[PDB]
């Protein structure tokens with residue numbers, strides 16, 4: 001019911017319209033490839049949109065709140081790991097505003 005609306009939100013976050021700032025969240029952070037040695041010490045519970053998508057498809061979310069908690073975890077990890085002036089942080093804030101807008105307007 002509210003879960004079905006969550007699918008629409010996720011689709012919005014992954015759509016072309018937001019690609020210029022969403023693209024770094026499309027896949028799990030690869031610490032080795034990016035050369036962030038300490039990412040997995042600092043970030044204990046990694047998250048990204050393709051993981052949210054899988055969990056949605058497998059019906060791992062029992063309600064809208066659990067879905068929101070994973071999306072917020074993704075943004076929180078980013079703010080936690082990266083300095084406040086980093087470009088990826090500015091990208092996260094823009095994507096999060098889209099997310100909090102759609103989540104707040106859900107019936």
Ligand SMILES: CC(=O)N1c2ccc(-c3ccco3)cc2[C@H](NC(=O)OC(C)C)C[C@@H]1C
Nearest residue numbers: 024025029030034036077078081082087088
């Ligand atoms: C989402 C997130 O917290 N990160 C992330 C994730 C993916 C990629 C990445 C790069 C290529 C594919 O994925 C890069 C980063 C960031 N480093 C960076 O130059 O970001 C630019 C967008 C300014 C570092 C950070 C660990």
